[PDB]
Amino acid sequence: PLTLRDVSEASGVSEMTVSRVLRNRGDVSDATRARVLAAAKELGYVPNKIAGALASNRVNLVAVIIPSLSNMVFPEVLTGINQVLEDTELQPVVGVTDYLPEKEEKVLYEMLSWRPSGVIIAGLEHSEAARAMLDAAGIPVVEIMDSDGKPVDAMVGISHRRAGREMAQAILKAGYRRIGFMGTKMPLDYRARKRFEGFTEVLGKNGVEIEDREFYSGGSALAKGREMTQAMLERSPDLDFLYYSNDMIAAGGLLYLLEQGIDIPGQIGLAGFNNVELLQGLPRKLATMDACRLEIGRKAAEIIAKRLEDPEAEIETRITLEPKISYGDTLKR
Amino acid sequence: PLTLRDVSEASGVSEMTVSRVLRNRGDVSDATRARVLAAAKELGYVPNKIAGALASNRVNLVAVIIPSLSNMVFPEVLTGINQVLEDTELQPVVGVTDYLPEKEEKVLYEMLSWRPSGVIIAGLEHSEAARAMLDAAGIPVVEIMDSDGKPVDAMVGISHRRAGREMAQAILKAGYRRIGFMGTKMPLDYRARKRFEGFTEVLGKNGVEIEDREFYSGGSALAKGREMTQAMLERSPDLDFLYYSNDMIAAGGLLYLLEQGIDIPGQIGLAGFNNVELLQGLPRKLATMDACRLEIGRKAAEIIAKRLEDPEAEIETRITLEPKISYGDTLKR
Incomplete structure (x- = not known):
C-alpha cells in the first residue's frame, strides 16, 4: 500500500x-x-x-497502437521506435487491435483518456469514431506502414499499391504465366489487400488472369503456408508462380515445395513480402520486398520527438519510402 | 484540443x-x-x-513488462492476457525491456508513475529498486514465466531448472552420449540459464558431459541457429544430440541438418524449448517442451482481475505449471 x-x-x-x-x-x-x-x-x-x-x-506516455505482435513485422517497428525515444523523455507503450476496427477504436479511446504525449498508429483506415478521435487529439499523430491514402496528421510508410504492381511486373518480365496468390488475415488487413490490387492491376493490364487464389481470414503462420500451398497445387497443378501476402506463409510453402522435390524456380517461382530476418535462415533465398519496418519505427518516433521539443517544429510530416525487391534465388531464371 | x-x-x-x-x-x-x-x-x-x-x-491500465517481442514467446502470452481482460474495463499495455535490468527499472518506474491498476512482469530477477517498487506498489503484481525463485506478490510460471533436468532424463535414456548445447541471449536470459543448469546436473550425475557448447549473447534467430549448428558439427562432427536454448535456433539447426541429408534421430537427434507454433510448419516435428505461454498470460490476467474486483477475495496467487516434454521425430528413436 x-x-x-x-x-x-x-x-x-x-x-x-x-x-x-x-x-x-x-x-x-x-x-x-x-x-x-x-x-x-x-x-x-x-x-x-x-x-x-x-x-x-x-x-510522458507515447501510444503505439498496432494490429499484431504475432507476425514479425511490428516487433521490428517497435524496436525502431524505442531506439529513438531511448533518449529517456517519452515512454512508448504498445496496444494491440487484432486488425479489428472496433477494437482499434476501443483501445485508442482508452489510451487517449490517459492524456498521452503522442500517438503512433498503424494504417490509414479507421472507423468514423476512431478517425474523429485522432483528429480531435491535440497531440501529434503518426499513422505508420501505409502511404496509400490521406493521413490525419503525420505519416510514414510505403505504397502497398506499388509493392503489388512492381512484383507483378518482375514476375511477368521473368516470364511467368498461370500465377496464383495466397494471403492471410483477409479481408481485415487493408495493406495486404492493396498489395494484391496492385498485383492484379498489372497482370490484367497485360492480359493475364491469376489462375488460382486462396484467402485465409485468420493469422499468418508457417503451417498455414504449407497447407494453402499444397491445397492450391493439387487444385491447380500447372501453376508456375506463387505470390504470398507475406514471408511467413511463403516460407511454409517453400519448405513444402522443396520437400516435394520441386525445382525452384525451374518449375515454380515464389515471392513474399516484408523481408523478415527469418528469411536468412532458410535453405533457399525467397524473393520479397522490404517493408522498411525498422526505419518506419525510427522515423515515426522521430516526428513525435521533434513535435514535442519545438511546437513550432516546421519539418516534414508525410514520408513515403520506396523499398526495392530483394530477388533472392526463387524468382529470376 | x-x-x-x-x-x-x-x-x-x-x-x-x-x-x-x-x-x-x-x-x-x-x-x-x-x-x-x-x-x-x-x-x-x-x-x-x-x-x-x-x-x-x-x-485502468495494466502494465505488461516483458523483455522481447522478437522471439516468438511473448506475443502469445499477451494474447492470453488480452482474452481475459477483454471482458473487464482494464486495458493492458506493453513495455519492452530488452532483458536489461537497468532498463526494466526505468520502464517500471515510468509506468508506476501513471498509477496503473496492476502489473505483469516477466521473471524473478530484478534490480534492487525495481524489486522495491514492485513491493511498494499497492496493486496486484504478477511475475510471469519463471516459478523458480521467490516472488514479490503473485506468480505464474514453470520451473526452468526442472525443464532442463527433464530434457536431460529423456536424452540420456534414449542412448545419446556426447551432447552439444547451443543457447542464445545468455547471460541476459536467466530462465534459459536455469534450463542449462538442470540439464547439466542430470548429465553430470550420470557421468556425462557436453562435448561441445556455445553460448550466444545476441537474439534468437533461425539463421543464427543455422550458423551455430554448422560451426559445431564442423568442430565436433561426432555429436549425436544437439540441445537448443529455444525452438527458433533449433529450427534453424534442424533445416540445416536435413539439408545436409543427415538422418534425425538416426545419426543425430535434437530438441529445443518453448513449443512455438512455427514448429508446426516444419518438415519434421522437433522435440521440445511447451512454455505454457497462453495459459500463463490468461492466468496472470485472471489474478489481477479477481484481485481488483474483490481485494478481500483470497485466491491462488502462486501458480506453478508443469508441462511435459513433446516428442515425435528428432529424439525417441
Missing part, C-alpha cells in the same frame, strides 16, 4: 517537504533533495506523475 | 451535465445521457479519466 506518510518516517522529514522536492518545486539544498528522493528509492515509492489536467499537462 | 464546452454546445446541455454523463456521477436520464455520449463521438471527444491521485485512485 505504502505512501507519503511513510517517506517521512524514513526521510524523517515533516510531511510538508517530501512533495516540494519530488516534483522540483521550491529551493531545498542539493542535500535535502537527494535526501528524500534516495529515501523513497529505498522504499520503492514512485511519484504520482499522472495526477493532472487534460491536454497541455500530459503524461 | 476539444473541451467539455464543445460537447456541451453540440449536445444542447450544460457542461455540468456533460461532466455528470461522462464522469458517470449524475442521475441524468438515458435520453440525455445518450445525446451527450452520441455528441462526444461525433466530435471525437475522449473524457480525461486520470483525475485520481496516488493510492486509491488508479488508472
Whole structure:
C-alpha cells in the first residue's frame, strides 16, 4: 500500500517537504533533495506523475497502437521506435487491435483518456469514431506502414499499391504465366489487400488472369503456408508462380515445395513480402520486398520527438519510402 | 484540443451535465445521457479519466513488462492476457525491456508513475529498486514465466531448472552420449540459464558431459541457429544430440541438418524449448517442451482481475505449471 506518510518516517522529514522536492518545486539544498528522493528509492515509492489536467499537462506516455505482435513485422517497428525515444523523455507503450476496427477504436479511446504525449498508429483506415478521435487529439499523430491514402496528421510508410504492381511486373518480365496468390488475415488487413490490387492491376493490364487464389481470414503462420500451398497445387497443378501476402506463409510453402522435390524456380517461382530476418535462415533465398519496418519505427518516433521539443517544429510530416525487391534465388531464371 | 464546452454546445446541455454523463456521477436520464455520449463521438471527444491521485485512485491500465517481442514467446502470452481482460474495463499495455535490468527499472518506474491498476512482469530477477517498487506498489503484481525463485506478490510460471533436468532424463535414456548445447541471449536470459543448469546436473550425475557448447549473447534467430549448428558439427562432427536454448535456433539447426541429408534421430537427434507454433510448419516435428505461454498470460490476467474486483477475495496467487516434454521425430528413436 505504502505512501507519503511513510517517506517521512524514513526521510524523517515533516510531511510538508517530501512533495516540494519530488516534483522540483521550491529551493531545498542539493542535500535535502537527494535526501528524500534516495529515501523513497529505498522504499520503492514512485511519484504520482499522472495526477493532472487534460491536454497541455500530459503524461510522458507515447501510444503505439498496432494490429499484431504475432507476425514479425511490428516487433521490428517497435524496436525502431524505442531506439529513438531511448533518449529517456517519452515512454512508448504498445496496444494491440487484432486488425479489428472496433477494437482499434476501443483501445485508442482508452489510451487517449490517459492524456498521452503522442500517438503512433498503424494504417490509414479507421472507423468514423476512431478517425474523429485522432483528429480531435491535440497531440501529434503518426499513422505508420501505409502511404496509400490521406493521413490525419503525420505519416510514414510505403505504397502497398506499388509493392503489388512492381512484383507483378518482375514476375511477368521473368516470364511467368498461370500465377496464383495466397494471403492471410483477409479481408481485415487493408495493406495486404492493396498489395494484391496492385498485383492484379498489372497482370490484367497485360492480359493475364491469376489462375488460382486462396484467402485465409485468420493469422499468418508457417503451417498455414504449407497447407494453402499444397491445397492450391493439387487444385491447380500447372501453376508456375506463387505470390504470398507475406514471408511467413511463403516460407511454409517453400519448405513444402522443396520437400516435394520441386525445382525452384525451374518449375515454380515464389515471392513474399516484408523481408523478415527469418528469411536468412532458410535453405533457399525467397524473393520479397522490404517493408522498411525498422526505419518506419525510427522515423515515426522521430516526428513525435521533434513535435514535442519545438511546437513550432516546421519539418516534414508525410514520408513515403520506396523499398526495392530483394530477388533472392526463387524468382529470376 | 476539444473541451467539455464543445460537447456541451453540440449536445444542447450544460457542461455540468456533460461532466455528470461522462464522469458517470449524475442521475441524468438515458435520453440525455445518450445525446451527450452520441455528441462526444461525433466530435471525437475522449473524457480525461486520470483525475485520481496516488493510492486509491488508479488508472485502468495494466502494465505488461516483458523483455522481447522478437522471439516468438511473448506475443502469445499477451494474447492470453488480452482474452481475459477483454471482458473487464482494464486495458493492458506493453513495455519492452530488452532483458536489461537497468532498463526494466526505468520502464517500471515510468509506468508506476501513471498509477496503473496492476502489473505483469516477466521473471524473478530484478534490480534492487525495481524489486522495491514492485513491493511498494499497492496493486496486484504478477511475475510471469519463471516459478523458480521467490516472488514479490503473485506468480505464474514453470520451473526452468526442472525443464532442463527433464530434457536431460529423456536424452540420456534414449542412448545419446556426447551432447552439444547451443543457447542464445545468455547471460541476459536467466530462465534459459536455469534450463542449462538442470540439464547439466542430470548429465553430470550420470557421468556425462557436453562435448561441445556455445553460448550466444545476441537474439534468437533461425539463421543464427543455422550458423551455430554448422560451426559445431564442423568442430565436433561426432555429436549425436544437439540441445537448443529455444525452438527458433533449433529450427534453424534442424533445416540445416536435413539439408545436409543427415538422418534425425538416426545419426543425430535434437530438441529445443518453448513449443512455438512455427514448429508446426516444419518438415519434421522437433522435440521440445511447451512454455505454457497462453495459459500463463490468461492466468496472470485472471489474478489481477479477481484481485481488483474483490481485494478481500483470497485466491491462488502462486501458480506453478508443469508441462511435459513433446516428442515425435528428432529424439525417441
